[PDB]
Structure formats: C-alpha cells, structure tokens
Design a protein around this nucleic acid. Sequence first.
RNA 1: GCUCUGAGGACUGACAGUCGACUC
RNA 2: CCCGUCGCUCCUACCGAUUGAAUGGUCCGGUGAAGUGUUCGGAUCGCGGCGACGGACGUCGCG
RNA 3: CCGGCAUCGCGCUCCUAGCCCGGCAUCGUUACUUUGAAGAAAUUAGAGUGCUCAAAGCAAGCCAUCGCUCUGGAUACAUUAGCAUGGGAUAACAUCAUAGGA
RNA 4: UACCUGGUUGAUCCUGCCAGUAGUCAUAUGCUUGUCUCAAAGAUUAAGCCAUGCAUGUGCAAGUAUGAACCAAUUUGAACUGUGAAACUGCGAAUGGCUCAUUAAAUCAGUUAUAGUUUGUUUGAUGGUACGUGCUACUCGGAUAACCGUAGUAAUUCUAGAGCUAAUACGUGCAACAAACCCCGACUUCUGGGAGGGGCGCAUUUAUUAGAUAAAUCCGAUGAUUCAUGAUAACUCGACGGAUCGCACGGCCUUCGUGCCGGCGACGCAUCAUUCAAAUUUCUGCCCUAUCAACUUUCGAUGGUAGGAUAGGGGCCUACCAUGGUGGUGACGGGUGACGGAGAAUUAGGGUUCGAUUCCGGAGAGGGAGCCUGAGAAACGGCUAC
Lengths: 145, 63, 178, 261
Amino acid sequence: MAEQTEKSFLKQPKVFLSTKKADKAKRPGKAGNRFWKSVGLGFKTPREAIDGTYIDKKCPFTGTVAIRGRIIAGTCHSAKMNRTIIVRRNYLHFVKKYQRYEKRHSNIPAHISPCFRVKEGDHVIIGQCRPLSKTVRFNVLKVVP
Amino acid sequence: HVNFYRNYGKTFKKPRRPYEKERLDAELKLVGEYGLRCKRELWRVQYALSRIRNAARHLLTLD
Amino acid sequence: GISRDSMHKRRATGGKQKAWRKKRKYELGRQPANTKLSSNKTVRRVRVRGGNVKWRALRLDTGNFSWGSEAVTRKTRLLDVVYNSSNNELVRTQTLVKNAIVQVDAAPFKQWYLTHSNNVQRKLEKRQQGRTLDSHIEEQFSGGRLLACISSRPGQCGRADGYILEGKELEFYMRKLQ
Amino acid sequence: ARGLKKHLKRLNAPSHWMLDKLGGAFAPKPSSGPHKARECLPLILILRNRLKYALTYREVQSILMQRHIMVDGKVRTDKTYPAGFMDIISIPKTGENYRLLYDTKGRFRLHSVRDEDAKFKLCKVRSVQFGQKGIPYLNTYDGRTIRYPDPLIKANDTIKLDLETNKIVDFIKFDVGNVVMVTGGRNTGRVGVIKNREKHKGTFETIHVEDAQGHQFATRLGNVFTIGKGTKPWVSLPKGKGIKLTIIEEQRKRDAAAQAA
RNA sequence: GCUCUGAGGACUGACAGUCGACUC
RNA sequence: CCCGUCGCUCCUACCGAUUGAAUGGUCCGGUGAAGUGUUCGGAUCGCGGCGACGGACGUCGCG
RNA sequence: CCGGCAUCGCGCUCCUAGCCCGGCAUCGUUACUUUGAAGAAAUUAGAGUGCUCAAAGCAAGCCAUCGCUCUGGAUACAUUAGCAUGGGAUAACAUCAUAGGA
RNA sequence: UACCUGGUUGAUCCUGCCAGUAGUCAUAUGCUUGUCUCAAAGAUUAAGCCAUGCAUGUGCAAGUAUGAACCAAUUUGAACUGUGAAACUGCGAAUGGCUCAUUAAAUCAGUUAUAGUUUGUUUGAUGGUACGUGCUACUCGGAUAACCGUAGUAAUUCUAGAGCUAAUACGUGCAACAAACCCCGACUUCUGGGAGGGGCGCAUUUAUUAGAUAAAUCCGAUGAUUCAUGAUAACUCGACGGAUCGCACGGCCUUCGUGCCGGCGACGCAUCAUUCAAAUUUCUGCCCUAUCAACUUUCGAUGGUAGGAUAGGGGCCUACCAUGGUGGUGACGGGUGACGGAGAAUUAGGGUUCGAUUCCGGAGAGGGAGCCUGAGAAACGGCUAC
Ligand SMILES: [Mg+2]
Ligand SMILES: [Mg+2]
Ligand SMILES: [Mg+2]
Ligand SMILES: [Mg+2]
Ligand SMILES: [Mg+2]
Ligand SMILES: [Mg+2]
Ligand SMILES: [Mg+2]
Ligand SMILES: [Mg+2]
Ligand SMILES: [Mg+2]
Ligand SMILES: [Mg+2]
Ligand SMILES: [Mg+2]
Ligand SMILES: [Mg+2]
Ligand SMILES: [Mg+2]
Ligand SMILES: [Mg+2]
C-alpha cells in the first residue's frame, strides 16, 4: 500500500494488525485500530493524523515521542528536508550599555510530522521532545499558514 | 584556610588635592581644638560622616 | 576505546570541535556481537554500569517465537536468516539481529494446531467454526518452515525471540523475497 | 567529579541552619535519608547548636550512642540524620518531646508537645498508585510508604501516622479553604487558609494563602503542606502563630517589650 | 583469482511476460 | 624664519638571492607497542563413572 | 485612589457558582510595565548587640547577676533569560471585500 | 568632596594633547619601624625537575583463633571462658588536597528536561512452590591465608614448593498451605457439566489482551503515554528466594529427656519508593579580529529508515536513501600573557578594567592512549604500552 516506501515494512509498535476478533470502536491502538495520542497542553490532534496512513516513530500524535519541557514559537526558515524544518526564532537582545535593543535570531531544527504541512515562512509552534538527532529536539505541534 | 573569610576594610580615604592652604588650615584647626594624634584621626571622621550622610541622602531620594 | 561522546563530531555549522576532556567511562561503546546462527549456543556475561548484567548472545539456534493471531507462543529452533532490511552482508553471514526475517520450525506449532470423548469434540466443534488460517500462512506449514521476524535484541538480552509474520507484513516480506 | 561528594564546607551549608561563618571549615553534611538534605536539620545541629546538650562533635556522638535520642518513635544512632518537617524527637530520659516545625522566617524551631500530641506524626503524600500484583500504595515526602491506602486518599493530600499501629488514622483532602504551613521559598513558615488554587497546563499549580490576620501571598504547589481541615490546624503552632510580620512591627513589638520593662 | 550483492535498459499487454550485449 | 639633495655618527623598522634556519602545532599516508573483544587453542586440575580389576591404569565425567 | 455600578455590555452549558443574581474556560501574536513565585551561601547595603573602641564577630543580656529565665542569629538587592496575575497608552509583527464572513 | 592645575603666544581666546593630583583585597623594591587585634604568603615566568620524610587505612557484644602470646587459672570432664596481636573476608581509598595547562555557545550562569536513564548506602515497605508424582521441605565439601618447615635472588609489600586449620570467602543443596487462576483431560450422562489426575515464587525476554462512559449496571494516575498495574502463552542452563553472628534466660512436661518453647538485636540477599548524586539535556547569555566571506560533505557533514552499541536519547557507529546544515544578526578561521561564575578596584549616574586564588561548576595529574577492581575511576598518593 502507499505509505510503505522503504526496505523494511514500517509499522507502529505494540499495534497488532492481523487480529482475529476485530472491531472499530474500542480504543485507538487496540483491537488493531491505529494508535494516536493527544499531545496535551491545549493542542489538538490533526484530522489527517487521526485518519492517516503514514507511520512515524517521531510524530507527537502517532508515535512514541512525548512533548515535555518548553514550547517555542517561530517561523519556518527552511523546508528542504525529509520530515524536518528549521524554525527561525526572531527576538530582541538588550545591550545594557546603550539602553537599546538589538535583534538576534536562532535557527532551531524541528521535525514536522507527515500530517502537518508547512510552506516556507509559515508560523509554527514547536515543543520539546527527547533528542531525536544531532540537531533535532523539537516536534512541530501547530502550524499557521 | 578559614580565618580567611573574616572581612576587613578601611576607615578613611586621603583627600584629593594634597596641598591647599584653606583645607590644610581647617584640618589644623580641628586637630588643634580636639587634640588629635595626627590627621588620620580627623580623616576617619569624615569617612564615617560621609557614609551616614550618603545613607541619609539615599533615603531622602525616596518618598 | 569506542566512545559515544559528541566531542569528536563537528558542530552543526561544521566548525571543528576541540577536545576539552579526556574520555570518560560513562561514554563507552563495545564491539558488536554479530550474533551467529549455529548449533553451539554460547551466551556470555558482561558486567555493566551499576554492577548488573548484560547477556551477549554470540550464537544461538533455539529461540522463542509467538503467534499473535492464534495467541500461541512456542519455543522453536532457528533455521536460517533469509532477509535483513539493513545489510545484505548480515543475510549472507547469518546474524540473528533485531527485526530480521528468520525461518523457524513449525514443529511445535503444527502439533499445537493438532491440539485445538464427548467433552473433547464438544469443544472442538465450538472451535473450527471460526478457524481463519490465511492461505499464505497455510502454504508455509506445508513447506514445513515458517517466516518469522526476530524482535529481541540478542546481543543485549541473550535471547532470540520473535513473532510469526502474518497479513500485510508477511505478504510484503514474501514479495520482497520472491 | 568521579563520585559522590561527602564533605560539605561550612559556607555551602544552607542559610536556615544559622551556623556561624568562622567556627570551622566544614558542615555536618546530612546523610542520604528521609528528607531532602536541603530542607532538613541534622541531629548534631539539633543537640549541639540549639539545645546545647553537648559542646562538641564527640559529645553529640556520646549522646546518640547512649541510645538516648528517638526519631519518629524509634531510636537513632546516626549523627547526620536528615530530620525534617514534623519529625518528632523524644528523649525518654527527659520524658521530653519536640516536633520540628518552621517559624515564619524559614528556620527550624523545636515546638514542644505532650505525649497524647506526640503519639502520632503528620505528613503529606507524594503520590498514590499501584505496585506488585495491583495493590495500591502511597509514598509520602517523608520517605514513608503505606500499603492499601484509603481509596479516597489522593496525591497532594495529608495524613496522620500513629507511631504504634504505623498506619493512617485520618487524612485531610488537599482542598481550598483549609490551612497550610508553607515549607519552602520566601513565604515558608506562614500558616494560612487557602483562598484559591490555579493550575497551568504543563507546569506548577499555585496556591493563594491568607494569614488569618489579613496578609495574602502565593506559592507553588511544591511547598504547601496542609495541616488541618478548615481554619483549625491539627498541630500545636509555634510561639508566633505562623504570622510573618513586617520589620516595622518587629520594631514596635520590641519597643512595647522594653517599655513595659 | 573465485563466489556473490547492487545500479544502469528494450520490446508486448506506476503492474505483469519475454529478452539483453555490455559498463560501473 | 626656513626647504631639499649630499657628507659624518647613532637608533628603528623595510625589501633581499639564499628550495635560509630553528621552534611548535595541523592534515594525508606508512609502520605500529599495548589494552579490550573475539576465533581456534588446551600446559594442568576437579565425582578420579567403568572394567566389580591388583594407592596403580585405559576406557570419562562433564566442567 | 478605587471597589462596584448604566447607557446603545455576541453567548455561555463546567469549578469558583446570589438573599431569577456579580465575577466563566478554550476559536491573533508579541514587545512594555505591575505584582508574585523561585531565586546558594561568603561579598555588597542594612538592623540588633560596649569584642574596651576599631576593622570585626554573630553574638549576647538580667537574675535574689543561688539549681534558669529572655533570646537573637532580621531585611534588602540580584541586570538579563525563563514561569505566572492584572493594566492595555505607547510601538512592531500579523490581517475581512472574490465575502470561503457572522 | 558630581573639583581641576603647569606647558604652544610679544600677550589673548581656543582645538589639543604632554605633565600634574588620587586609589588598588595590586605586585616588586628602597629607606625606616616600639605596642595590641587582624592575616596574604612559588599564581604571573617554568602545568619545568625533584633528594628526603610524612599525606588512607580500618575491629564492634555481635564473620574467622587452642595456627603463636597475656591475664584469670581445673574437682585435670569441657573451655579458648575474658584480653588480645597477625592474617583471611567486608568497606573505603572515586572524598579531601593542589594547580589552571587545555578549552571562546564549548566549560559556566539563570532556568528547563528525563515519558530518554544509572544510583553502594540511609530511611520506609515488600519476599510462597528451590520440586513432590505441588497431597505442608528429603543432607552437611575440601583448600585456603596467617603458623610450621625448606629455598631462589644482589634485589624490593620480588618469588617456588611441602605440611596443619576456618568462614557471612568459595561451591552446594531440604522449601509454606487452599493451590486461588490457567491449559490437556479418563469415564460418567449429553452436560451451560461432574470431573478422577497431569503440568503454574519472583526476576529475564518476547508476543496477544485488559487498563472501562455521553445527557433520555463503569472501578488508579498524568497537561500528555500502547501509563501504573493485572491476566495469559511460553522463555532463561537464574543473579535471587538466609547452611550466617551476639548477649538476655524462662512460662510450663508431650517420653519430666538444656524437655514444648519464644523475645530483643547484628549481618545480608532481591524488587519498589526515597535520599545522596551523576549523566545527558532546552532557551538565553562571552572578549579582539573581515589584512579571517565563505565553511561543512568520499572517510557522518544535515536529515530519513533498519539496526548495532550504551544505563539511556543521539550519526554514538554501520547499511541503504536523500543533499542537505551554517553564514553581514560575523559562520568558519585567527589572537588571547582566556578555565566560567559568585564576585574585586574605581565609581554622582552611565560605565572602565579585572577575576590564578580558599565558595560553586569544569579540567588535569610529565605528554598522549588503553584498561582491571568496583555502585561509582578511562582513577595515576591503581595498572598496561609508547
Ligand atoms: Mg576534588
Ligand atoms: Mg555523614
Ligand atoms: Mg566623571
Ligand atoms: Mg604654535
Ligand atoms: Mg614663551
Ligand atoms: Mg598622567
Ligand atoms: Mg596564569
Ligand atoms: Mg535508532
Ligand atoms: Mg591558559
Ligand atoms: Mg575548585
Ligand atoms: Mg611537574
Ligand atoms: Mg582525573
Ligand atoms: Mg590516568
Ligand atoms: Mg603524588
């Protein structure tokens, strides 16, 4: 089927697919239903994450990543990766000698789930997870385009 | 080495312009009237007085 | 020796990262196990942080394989690795490694499926009214040797465990193998 | 370092231990125990510095291995035992009980009690949740654990523990309207009745408190410690009924103390 | 040197059938 | 009043053939102690089974 | 200086919720400022205390200076970054004319 | 104490610098020194070299003593009674202590995180079945230090062999119901069964499953979890489930049998919680330099998947795929006589300079590299190599 694109058959952990006694409204992730979870903190799961086909061990709503720590907001600065973006956190620095402000910026890598869909320069809200790579520690939880 | 931690500071500051007839005569007046051992003794009093006056001034700045 | 510190790596911008400590123990790595598939089972101790134990599975033939659809988990003998999605070198050299596709006996499984007076048939007929037995797992018993996916960390826990393939995953791996 | 640090030098010893600066290089370094070693008071600081039952390190060692000292009702030979909030120290040779309570300045006092108000102690619960075979149990902030807890007892609540049956005798449900005695931060010591509790998704939930004589403050959920249901606490409060008063009033009280003397 | 792995196509009816001398 | 070339003394740096030299680091390449892990390996050392033998043996017990 | 109040105050079903009732949730972001939490001690200021003063120190004082009383060991600051309440002038960023609006 | 004065001129008014004046918990030195309190003192250069001596060992009523001594000393049964050195076993030596060589978003500071982890101990709770055909547990091993004796060597906590003797060292091995629940199941009678009897501590690994609602008999947590946890099928050559040690004597005969007994302690084994910690970690914050405008990428550089390794996340490493990451908001590089900070001097306010140093964090033991013991060390008052 469409999503399986690699050399290994991708599937969700602890979800059991070929089950004899099947039914559709038990709890998601049970009875062979797809697993999804609600990240909390007032955020809401995406519709297409709910009824999605993609598999990602790093999506907050369909994977094993727990969003805990801090939540930053930024703007997407590059969307040229596989399931990952770079958010630019523009902010203002205070230099004490001059009593004036100088703008700085920090480019923070963030993992976009396949459910989300970001275009270059779209506002994003991202939340801290466990270190997912050398440069990724944030999952994109919200996108405003 | 504790006994290192015991604070200690100074008690005076020497005046800026070392040689003026007016200040020098005022100091000799005070040392003569109050019978001092040297003008270090006079110079401590201004240090203490300056500290208290500055304490008062910082208060009077507020409401 | 081997290390897991990030000191040797380059910064994200690429600038070289000067080394400012000498290596510490809590960042040690150890040479892999390359768990063979052989008759001479030998799994050996290592004493790791905290004084507890890790069982390095250097070579195994007997593992523990589950069957989720039927909820039956039988010990069985490893036949051979047939597919690995990480390294064909591991297929050729026969390394029991997590999420490989091994082939197993169906010997405990056939007689378990043979299991399942009046009280017996009164239960057997209660079953046999819901038997499913997909044709694709069906032909595999006739072949006498079952595609199963190893799903333990042999070099970590000293066991080869796993689960029989069924459904989408079985059809997909089988289609790769043809 | 390469391992645990076992010396604690005197100037690193927390502020509320009151111990002087030039009496030596080191400080008693409370052992890993039932209280958090930052919110504690070792038995040597209890005997030597406050009660003056000894005059040196070795003299407190003599006191403790005479087997004279009792903590939570059982004798204790340790000499850097991290006693904490509402630990009871009895000295049966003196028939004398202390219960270790804060004052409004954030320091420990030894508030005396009789025996009927010493047979039990009082502590809050860290968490209630399951264990082996599905038996519920709770874990306090005192280290103590209770099995088969009363199925109403929730997290953040407070319990009384008798020192003979060694189980619950009652529990106060952490709620609005009952009194607390904050045990950390600048507000520690001040008793007072909750008027509000606001929760924020993802971080600390704060409690607004009022000193029964009017003053109002707030503190996060960590350092609150409900004492009694309603306004009446279930423990004998210290000499000043948990009211922190302005430094101006601490001047007026000393003026009024001297002007009647 | 030997044994292999992979990539790179054509024709016929995003898949299936047949074929394919060569290069990496 | 004062400007420059030239002559003499002294200081400072400059260019300079010299495949200049010394010192120290860095990368690639060669050789590579030793440790760790592993494949074989098996000096000796433990019920010293049995022959139902006359403290002695081979067949051994696996470790 | 404010509580509370009407005009020409888009809703509330949920906690707080009146002797049909103030003052209730989710459907733009911040910057600014206020209050609070939490803020390692030593240092810095600052209180108390006759180490003789002092730099200090964290002591120490009266009992009939006769079988112990009264005790202290405060407070302040902590620029920024982060957490939270209320203010919403000042200024950015963002944006309802295709009506895909309410 | 928010301060100015001498010098360009024949004089004058200026820009302007030179000089003056003051301080340093800032160093050297000169000259001089009678008293009390206070107290820095091989850091700057050379984190260069070291004679010598010391700096980490340890014994309670509670592990092991006629292996040799000392004090009581016997009716000459039995003690090693009591004090004991030595040695074995256990624990610690990973703390302190010194120094600042390395190192410029790095260490460090404020503040986060662990649902991404390890933790001797202290404190609190907890502990079936070891096989027996689950029908209430079925038996006691040498060898080993110190000591004796016999040696090598020039040698040193260098070393070989013979002979004794111990364990809380080592190696074994008796196990507590109803068996609750689970799966096979004779024959009975037909069963929605009776079932006669056959297999089930906890830990490890894996897999299936439960972990419940909404207004006209559901029952734990979190902001959020396939969470806590339960049940089941098995799996493991199981670490574990006590062959351990002290005083205090004291109710009462079942064969009056140290008789049936039973308390107070020590030590210890495993799981959970806690505590002392660490490790990794998120945001923001560092000096001069553009005569440092491109750096990283075959050999991990940014990401994806699959996996290995680790206590654990992670390009920490491998295979395959993608070509990304950073940069005028200063990347990369270069300098630092640069460990970071709390803080020190001076200060009207703003600032300027400093911070080796006793408090905290890091790093290092002549330079590097690699390891064993251990909960903890990439340890140097431990080893291995150059
Ligand atoms: Mg140290
Ligand atoms: Mg201690
Ligand atoms: Mg000025
Ligand atoms: Mg002129
Ligand atoms: Mg002139
Ligand atoms: Mg000058
Ligand atoms: Mg230096
Ligand atoms: Mg991975
Ligand atoms: Mg340096
Ligand atoms: Mg230090
Ligand atoms: Mg040296
Ligand atoms: Mg070191
Ligand atoms: Mg070393
Ligand atoms: Mg040394």
